[PDB]
Coordinates of N, CA and C in Angstrom, one line a residue:
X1 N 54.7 -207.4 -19.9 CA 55.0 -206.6 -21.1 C 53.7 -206.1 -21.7
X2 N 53.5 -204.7 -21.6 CA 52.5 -204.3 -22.4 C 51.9 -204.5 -23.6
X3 N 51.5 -205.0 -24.4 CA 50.8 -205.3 -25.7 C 49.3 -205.0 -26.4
X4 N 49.3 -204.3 -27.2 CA 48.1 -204.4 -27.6 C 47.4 -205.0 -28.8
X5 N 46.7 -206.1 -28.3 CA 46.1 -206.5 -29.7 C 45.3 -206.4 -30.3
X6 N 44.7 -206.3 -31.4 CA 43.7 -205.6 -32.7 C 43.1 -206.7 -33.2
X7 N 42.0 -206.9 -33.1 CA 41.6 -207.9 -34.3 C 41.2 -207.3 -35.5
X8 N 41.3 -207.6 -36.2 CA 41.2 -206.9 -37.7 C 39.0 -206.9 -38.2
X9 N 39.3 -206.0 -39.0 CA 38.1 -205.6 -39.5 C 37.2 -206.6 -39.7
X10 N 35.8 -206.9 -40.0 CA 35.2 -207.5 -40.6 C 34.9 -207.5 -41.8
X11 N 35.3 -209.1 -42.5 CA 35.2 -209.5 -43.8 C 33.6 -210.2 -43.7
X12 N 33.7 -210.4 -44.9 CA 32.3 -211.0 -45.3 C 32.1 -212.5 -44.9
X13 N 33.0 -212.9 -44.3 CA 32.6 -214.5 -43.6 C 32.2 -214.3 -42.0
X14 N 32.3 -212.8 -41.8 CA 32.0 -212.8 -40.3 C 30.5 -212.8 -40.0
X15 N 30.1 -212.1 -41.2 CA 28.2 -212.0 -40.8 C 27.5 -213.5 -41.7
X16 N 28.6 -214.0 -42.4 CA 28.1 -215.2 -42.7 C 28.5 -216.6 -41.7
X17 N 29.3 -216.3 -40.7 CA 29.6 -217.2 -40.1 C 30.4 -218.8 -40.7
X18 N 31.1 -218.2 -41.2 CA 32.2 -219.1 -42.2 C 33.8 -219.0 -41.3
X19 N 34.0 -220.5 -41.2 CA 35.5 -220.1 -40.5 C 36.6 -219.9 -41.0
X20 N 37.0 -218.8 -41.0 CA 38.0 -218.3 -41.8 C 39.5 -217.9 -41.3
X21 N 40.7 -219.0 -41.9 CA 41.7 -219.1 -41.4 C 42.7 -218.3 -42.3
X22 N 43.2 -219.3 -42.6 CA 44.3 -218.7 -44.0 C 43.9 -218.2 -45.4
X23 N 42.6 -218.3 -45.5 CA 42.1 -217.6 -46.7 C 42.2 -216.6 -46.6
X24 N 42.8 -216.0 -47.7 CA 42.8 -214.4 -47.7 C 41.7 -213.7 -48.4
X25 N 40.9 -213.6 -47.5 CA 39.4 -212.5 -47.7 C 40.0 -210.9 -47.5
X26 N 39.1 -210.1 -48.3 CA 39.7 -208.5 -47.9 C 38.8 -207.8 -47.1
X27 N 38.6 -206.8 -46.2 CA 37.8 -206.2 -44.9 C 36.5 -206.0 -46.1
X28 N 35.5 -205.6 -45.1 CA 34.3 -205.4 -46.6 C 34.1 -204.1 -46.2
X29 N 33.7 -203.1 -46.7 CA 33.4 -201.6 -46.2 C 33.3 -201.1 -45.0
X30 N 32.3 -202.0 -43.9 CA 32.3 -201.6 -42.8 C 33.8 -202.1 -42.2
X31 N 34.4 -203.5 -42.3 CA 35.4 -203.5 -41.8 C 36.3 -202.3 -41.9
X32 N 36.7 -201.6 -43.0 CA 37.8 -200.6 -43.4 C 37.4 -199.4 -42.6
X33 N 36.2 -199.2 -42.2 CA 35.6 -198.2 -41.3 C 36.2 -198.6 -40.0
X34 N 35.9 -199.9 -39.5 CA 36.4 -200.6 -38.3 C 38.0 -200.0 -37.9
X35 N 38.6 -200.1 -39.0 CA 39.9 -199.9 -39.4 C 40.4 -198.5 -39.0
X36 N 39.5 -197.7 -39.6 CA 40.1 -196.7 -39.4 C 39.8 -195.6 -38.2
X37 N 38.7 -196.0 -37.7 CA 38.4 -195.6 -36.3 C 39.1 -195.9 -35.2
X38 N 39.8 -196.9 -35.3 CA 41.3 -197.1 -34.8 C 42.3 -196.3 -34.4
X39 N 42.2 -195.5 -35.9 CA 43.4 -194.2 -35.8 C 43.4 -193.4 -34.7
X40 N 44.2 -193.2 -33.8 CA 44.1 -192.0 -32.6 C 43.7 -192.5 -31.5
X41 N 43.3 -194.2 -31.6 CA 42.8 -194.8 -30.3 C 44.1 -196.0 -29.8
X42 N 44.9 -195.9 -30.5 CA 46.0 -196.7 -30.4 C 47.2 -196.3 -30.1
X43 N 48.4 -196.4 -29.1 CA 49.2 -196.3 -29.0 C 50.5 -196.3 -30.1
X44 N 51.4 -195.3 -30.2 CA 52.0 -194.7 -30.9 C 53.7 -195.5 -30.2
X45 N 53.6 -197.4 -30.8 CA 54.4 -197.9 -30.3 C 54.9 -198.9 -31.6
X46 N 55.9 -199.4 -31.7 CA 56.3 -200.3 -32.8 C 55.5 -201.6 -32.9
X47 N 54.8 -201.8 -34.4 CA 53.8 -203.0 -34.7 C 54.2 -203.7 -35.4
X48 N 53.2 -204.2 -35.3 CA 53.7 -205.8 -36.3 C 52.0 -206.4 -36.8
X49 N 52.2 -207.3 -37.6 CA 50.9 -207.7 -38.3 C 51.0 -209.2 -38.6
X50 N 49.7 -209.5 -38.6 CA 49.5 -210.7 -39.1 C 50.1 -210.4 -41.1
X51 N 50.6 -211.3 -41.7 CA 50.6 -211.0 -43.2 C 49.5 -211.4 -44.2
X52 N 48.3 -211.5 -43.7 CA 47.1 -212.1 -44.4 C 46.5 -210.3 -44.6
X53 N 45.7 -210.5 -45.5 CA 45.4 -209.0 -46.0 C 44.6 -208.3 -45.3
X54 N 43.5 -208.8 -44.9 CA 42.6 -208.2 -43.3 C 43.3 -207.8 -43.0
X55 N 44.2 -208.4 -42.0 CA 45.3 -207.7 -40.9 C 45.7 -206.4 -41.5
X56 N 46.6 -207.0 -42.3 CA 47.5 -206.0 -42.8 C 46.8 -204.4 -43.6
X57 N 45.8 -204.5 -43.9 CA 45.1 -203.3 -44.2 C 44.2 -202.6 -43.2
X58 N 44.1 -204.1 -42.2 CA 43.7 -202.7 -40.9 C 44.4 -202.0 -40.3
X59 N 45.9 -202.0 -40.5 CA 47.3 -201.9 -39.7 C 47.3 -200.6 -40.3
X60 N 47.5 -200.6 -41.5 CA 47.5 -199.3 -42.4 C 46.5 -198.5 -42.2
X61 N 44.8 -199.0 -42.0 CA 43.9 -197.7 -42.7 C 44.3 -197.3 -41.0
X62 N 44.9 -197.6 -39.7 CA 44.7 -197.1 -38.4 C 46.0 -196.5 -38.2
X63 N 46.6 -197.0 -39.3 CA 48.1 -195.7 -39.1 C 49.6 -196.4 -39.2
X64 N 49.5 -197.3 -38.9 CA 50.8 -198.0 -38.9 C 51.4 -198.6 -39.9
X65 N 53.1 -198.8 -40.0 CA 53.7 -199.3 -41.2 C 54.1 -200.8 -40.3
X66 N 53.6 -202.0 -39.9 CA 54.0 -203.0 -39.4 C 55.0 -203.7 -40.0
X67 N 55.7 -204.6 -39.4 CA 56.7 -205.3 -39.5 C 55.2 -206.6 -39.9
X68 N 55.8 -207.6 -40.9 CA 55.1 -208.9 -41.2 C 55.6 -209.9 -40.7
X69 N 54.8 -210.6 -39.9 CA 55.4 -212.0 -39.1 C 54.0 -213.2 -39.6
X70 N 54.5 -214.1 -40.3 CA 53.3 -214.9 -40.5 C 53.0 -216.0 -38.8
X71 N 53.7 -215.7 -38.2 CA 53.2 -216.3 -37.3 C 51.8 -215.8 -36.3
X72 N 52.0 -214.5 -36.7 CA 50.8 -213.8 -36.1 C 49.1 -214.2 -36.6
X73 N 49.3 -215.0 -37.8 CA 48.0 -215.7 -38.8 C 46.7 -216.2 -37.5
X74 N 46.1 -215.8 -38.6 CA 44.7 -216.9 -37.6 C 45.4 -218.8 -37.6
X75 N 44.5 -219.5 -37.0 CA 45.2 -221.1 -37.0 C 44.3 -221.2 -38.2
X76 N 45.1 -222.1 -39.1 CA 45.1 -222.9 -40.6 C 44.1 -224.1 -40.1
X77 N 42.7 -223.8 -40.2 CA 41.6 -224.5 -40.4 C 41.6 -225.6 -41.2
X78 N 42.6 -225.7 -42.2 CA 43.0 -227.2 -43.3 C 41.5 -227.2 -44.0
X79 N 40.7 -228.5 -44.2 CA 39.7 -229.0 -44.8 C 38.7 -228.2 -44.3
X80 N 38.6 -227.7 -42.8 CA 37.1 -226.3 -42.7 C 37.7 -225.4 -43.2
X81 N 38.9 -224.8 -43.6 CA 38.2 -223.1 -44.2 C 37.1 -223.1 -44.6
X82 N 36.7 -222.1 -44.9 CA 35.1 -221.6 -45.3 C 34.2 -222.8 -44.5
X83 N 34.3 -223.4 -43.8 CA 32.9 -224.2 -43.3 C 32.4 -223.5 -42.7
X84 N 30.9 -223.5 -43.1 CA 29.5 -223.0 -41.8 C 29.6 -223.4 -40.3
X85 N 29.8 -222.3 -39.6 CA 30.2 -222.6 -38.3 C 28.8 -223.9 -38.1
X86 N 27.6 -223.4 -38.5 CA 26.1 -223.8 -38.2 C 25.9 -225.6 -38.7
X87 N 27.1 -226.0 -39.7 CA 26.9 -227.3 -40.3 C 28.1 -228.1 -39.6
X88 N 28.6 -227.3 -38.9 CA 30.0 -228.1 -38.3 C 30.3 -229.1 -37.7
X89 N 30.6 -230.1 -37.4 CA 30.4 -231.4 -37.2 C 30.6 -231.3 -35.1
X90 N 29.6 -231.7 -34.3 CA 29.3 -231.4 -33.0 C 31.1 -231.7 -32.4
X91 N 31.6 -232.7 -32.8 CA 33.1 -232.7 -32.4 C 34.5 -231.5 -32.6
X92 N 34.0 -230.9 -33.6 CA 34.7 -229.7 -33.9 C 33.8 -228.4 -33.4
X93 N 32.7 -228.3 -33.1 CA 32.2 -227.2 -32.4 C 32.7 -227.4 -31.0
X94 N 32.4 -228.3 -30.6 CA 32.7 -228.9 -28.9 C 34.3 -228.4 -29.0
X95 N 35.2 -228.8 -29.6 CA 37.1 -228.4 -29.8 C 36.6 -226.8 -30.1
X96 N 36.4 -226.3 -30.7 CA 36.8 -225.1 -30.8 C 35.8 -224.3 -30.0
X97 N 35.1 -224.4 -29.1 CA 33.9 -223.8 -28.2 C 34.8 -224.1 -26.5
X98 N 35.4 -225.8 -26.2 CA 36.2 -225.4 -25.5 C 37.9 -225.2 -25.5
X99 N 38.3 -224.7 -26.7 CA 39.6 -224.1 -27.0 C 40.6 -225.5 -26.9
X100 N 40.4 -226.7 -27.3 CA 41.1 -227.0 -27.1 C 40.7 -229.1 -27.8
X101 N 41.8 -229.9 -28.1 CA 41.6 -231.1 -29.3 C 41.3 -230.6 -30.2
X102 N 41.5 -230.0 -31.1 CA 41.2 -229.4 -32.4 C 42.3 -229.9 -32.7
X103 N 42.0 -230.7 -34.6 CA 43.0 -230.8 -35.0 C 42.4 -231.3 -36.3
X104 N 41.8 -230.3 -37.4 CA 41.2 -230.4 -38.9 C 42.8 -230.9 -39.8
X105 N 42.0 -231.8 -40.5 CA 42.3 -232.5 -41.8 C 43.1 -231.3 -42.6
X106 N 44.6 -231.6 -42.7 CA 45.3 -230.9 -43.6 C 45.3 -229.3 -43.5
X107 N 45.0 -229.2 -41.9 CA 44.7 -228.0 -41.3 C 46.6 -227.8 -39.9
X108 N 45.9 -227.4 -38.9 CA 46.9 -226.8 -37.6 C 46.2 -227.3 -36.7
X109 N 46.3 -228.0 -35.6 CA 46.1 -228.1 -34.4 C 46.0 -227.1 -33.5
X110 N 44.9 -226.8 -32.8 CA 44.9 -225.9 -31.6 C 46.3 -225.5 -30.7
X111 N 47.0 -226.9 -30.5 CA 48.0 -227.3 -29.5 C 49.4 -226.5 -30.4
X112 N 49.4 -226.5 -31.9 CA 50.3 -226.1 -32.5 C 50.5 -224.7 -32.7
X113 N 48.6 -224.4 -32.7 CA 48.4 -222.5 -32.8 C 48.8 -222.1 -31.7
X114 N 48.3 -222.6 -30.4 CA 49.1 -222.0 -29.4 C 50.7 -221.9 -29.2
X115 N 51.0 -222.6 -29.3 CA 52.7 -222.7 -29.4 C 53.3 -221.7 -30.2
X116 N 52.8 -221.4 -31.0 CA 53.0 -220.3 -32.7 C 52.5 -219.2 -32.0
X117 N 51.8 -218.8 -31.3 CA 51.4 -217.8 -31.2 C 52.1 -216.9 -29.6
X118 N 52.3 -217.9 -28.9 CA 53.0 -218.0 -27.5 C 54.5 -217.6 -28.1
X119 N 55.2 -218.1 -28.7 CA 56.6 -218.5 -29.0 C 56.8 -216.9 -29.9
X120 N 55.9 -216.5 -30.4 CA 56.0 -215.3 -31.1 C 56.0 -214.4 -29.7
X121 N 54.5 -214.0 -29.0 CA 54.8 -213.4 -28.1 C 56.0 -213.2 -27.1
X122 N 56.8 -214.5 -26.9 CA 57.8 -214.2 -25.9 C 59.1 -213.7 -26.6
X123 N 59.3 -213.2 -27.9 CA 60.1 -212.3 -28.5 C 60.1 -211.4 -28.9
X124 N 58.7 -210.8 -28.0 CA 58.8 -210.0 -27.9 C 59.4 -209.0 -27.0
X125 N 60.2 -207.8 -27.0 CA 61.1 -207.6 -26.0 C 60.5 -206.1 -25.1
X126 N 59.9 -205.1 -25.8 CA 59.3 -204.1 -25.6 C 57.7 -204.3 -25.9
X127 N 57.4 -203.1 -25.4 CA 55.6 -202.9 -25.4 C 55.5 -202.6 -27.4
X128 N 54.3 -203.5 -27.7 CA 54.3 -203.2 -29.0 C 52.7 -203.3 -29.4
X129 N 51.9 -202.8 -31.0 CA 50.4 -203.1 -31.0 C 50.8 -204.3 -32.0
X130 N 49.7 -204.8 -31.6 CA 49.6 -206.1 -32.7 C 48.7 -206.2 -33.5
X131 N 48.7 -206.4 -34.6 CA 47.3 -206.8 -36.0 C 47.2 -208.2 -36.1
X132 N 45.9 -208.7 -35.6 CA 46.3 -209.9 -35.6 C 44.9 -210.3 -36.0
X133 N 44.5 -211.8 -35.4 CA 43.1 -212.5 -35.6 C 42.2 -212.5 -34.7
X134 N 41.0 -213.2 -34.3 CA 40.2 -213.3 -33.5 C 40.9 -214.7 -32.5
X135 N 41.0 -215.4 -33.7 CA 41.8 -216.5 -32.8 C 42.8 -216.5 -31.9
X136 N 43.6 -215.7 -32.1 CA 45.3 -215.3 -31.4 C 44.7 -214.4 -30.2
X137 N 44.0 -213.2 -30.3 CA 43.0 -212.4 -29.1 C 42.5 -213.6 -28.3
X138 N 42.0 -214.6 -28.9 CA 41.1 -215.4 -28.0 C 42.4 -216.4 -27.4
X139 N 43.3 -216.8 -28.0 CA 44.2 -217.7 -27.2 C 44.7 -216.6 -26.1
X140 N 45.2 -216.0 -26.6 CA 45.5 -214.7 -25.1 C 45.0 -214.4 -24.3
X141 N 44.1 -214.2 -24.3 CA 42.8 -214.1 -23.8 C 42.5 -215.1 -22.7
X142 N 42.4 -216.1 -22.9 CA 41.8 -217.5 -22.3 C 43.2 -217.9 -21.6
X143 N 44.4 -218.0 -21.8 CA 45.5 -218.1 -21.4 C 45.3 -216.7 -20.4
X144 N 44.8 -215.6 -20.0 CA 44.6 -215.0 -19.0 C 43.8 -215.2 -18.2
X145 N 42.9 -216.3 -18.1 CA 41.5 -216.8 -17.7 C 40.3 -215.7 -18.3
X146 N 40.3 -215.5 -19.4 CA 39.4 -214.4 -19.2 C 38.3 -214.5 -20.8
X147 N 37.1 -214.3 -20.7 CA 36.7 -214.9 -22.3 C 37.2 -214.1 -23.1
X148 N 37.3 -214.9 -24.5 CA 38.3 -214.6 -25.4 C 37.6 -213.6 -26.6
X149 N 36.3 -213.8 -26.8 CA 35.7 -212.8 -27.9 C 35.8 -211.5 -27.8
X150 N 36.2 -210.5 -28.8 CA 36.2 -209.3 -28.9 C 35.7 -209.4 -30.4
X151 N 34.9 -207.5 -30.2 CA 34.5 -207.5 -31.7 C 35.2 -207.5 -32.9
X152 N 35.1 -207.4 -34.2 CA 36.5 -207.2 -35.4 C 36.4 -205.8 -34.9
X153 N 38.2 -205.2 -35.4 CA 38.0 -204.2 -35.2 C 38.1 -203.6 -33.6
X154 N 38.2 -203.9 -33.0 CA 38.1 -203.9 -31.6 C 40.2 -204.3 -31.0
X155 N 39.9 -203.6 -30.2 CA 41.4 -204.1 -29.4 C 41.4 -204.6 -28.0
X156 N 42.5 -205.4 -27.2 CA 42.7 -205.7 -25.6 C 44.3 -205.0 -25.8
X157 N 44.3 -204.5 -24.5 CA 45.6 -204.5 -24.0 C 45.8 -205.6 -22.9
X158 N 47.4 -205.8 -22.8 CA 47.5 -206.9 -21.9 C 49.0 -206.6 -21.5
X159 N 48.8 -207.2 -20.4 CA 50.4 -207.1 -19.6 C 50.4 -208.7 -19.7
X160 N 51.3 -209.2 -20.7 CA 51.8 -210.5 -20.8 C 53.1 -210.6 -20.2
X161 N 53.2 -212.1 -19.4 CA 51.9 -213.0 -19.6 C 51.3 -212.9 -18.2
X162 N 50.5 -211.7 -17.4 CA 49.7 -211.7 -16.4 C 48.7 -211.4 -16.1
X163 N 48.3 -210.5 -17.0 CA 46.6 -210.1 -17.1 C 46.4 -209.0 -17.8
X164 N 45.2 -209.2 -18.2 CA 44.4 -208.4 -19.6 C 44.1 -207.0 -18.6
X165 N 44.3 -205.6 -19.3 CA 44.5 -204.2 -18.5 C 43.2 -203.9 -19.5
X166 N 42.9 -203.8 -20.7 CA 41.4 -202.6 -20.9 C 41.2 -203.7 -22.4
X167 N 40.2 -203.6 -22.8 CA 39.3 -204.2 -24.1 C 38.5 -203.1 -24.5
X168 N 38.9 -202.3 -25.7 CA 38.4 -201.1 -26.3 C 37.6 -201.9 -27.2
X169 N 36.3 -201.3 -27.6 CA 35.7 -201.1 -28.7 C 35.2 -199.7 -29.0
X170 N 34.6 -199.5 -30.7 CA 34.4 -198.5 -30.4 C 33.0 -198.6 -31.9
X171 N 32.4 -197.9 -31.7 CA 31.0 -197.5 -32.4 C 31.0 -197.0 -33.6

């Protein structure tokens, strides 16, 4: 099944390097730029969005009226939101560097984000664009063997669940 997914613009924890889950940060200038350079590079197919406000305003400044699914969220960090990726304790860098035992204090488990994010995608029924997180791109991603970073702002297409077809950025 065709899909394309978007990570949303850059907010201000991305050049600060702050991990940012469920907190609702808004794109910062250059993200909304990210956003809108989007327009006319995206397929003209039924969307949907993460409902955190990044998402959802990149959805819009790039053209689309998305359907809201909170499953689409980045994974709920719990006790790290906002932590410095740079002060982060070597056991949670090590889990989130290789995708996997992650499971923060009053936060989501790695094992639960995937399942949330999987369980959404297979209801899907037709080809559709997605507004989503860095994290959900990277679980896709890695679940196709393939590394998971893309820039904000930036899209993959992907034939789920068999392999990643193009990774757009754009300037």
């Amino acid at each position: 099944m065709e899909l394309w997914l978007v990570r949303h613009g850059e907010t201000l924890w991305n050049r600060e390097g702050r991990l940012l889950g469920w907190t609702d940060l808004p794109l910062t200038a250059e993200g909304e730029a990210q956003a809108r350079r989007l327009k006319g590079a995206l397929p003209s197919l039924p969307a949907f969005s993460s409902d955190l406000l990044r998402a959802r305003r990149t959805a819009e400044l790039a053209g689309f009226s998305p359907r809201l699914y909170p499953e689409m969220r980045e994974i709920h960090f719990g006790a790290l939101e906002g932590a410095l990726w740079e002060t982060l304790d070597p056991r949670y860098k090590e889990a989130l560097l290789r995708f996997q035992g992650f499971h923060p204090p009053g936060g989501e488990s790695l094992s639960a984000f995937q399942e949330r994010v999987f369980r959404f995608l297979e209801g899907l029924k037709a080809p559709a664009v997605l507004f989503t997180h860095g994290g959900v791109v990277r679980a896709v991603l890695r679940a196709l063997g393939e590394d998971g970073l893309v820039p904000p702002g930036s899209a993959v297409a992907v034939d789920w669940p068999r392999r990643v077809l193009v990774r757009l950025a754009l300037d």
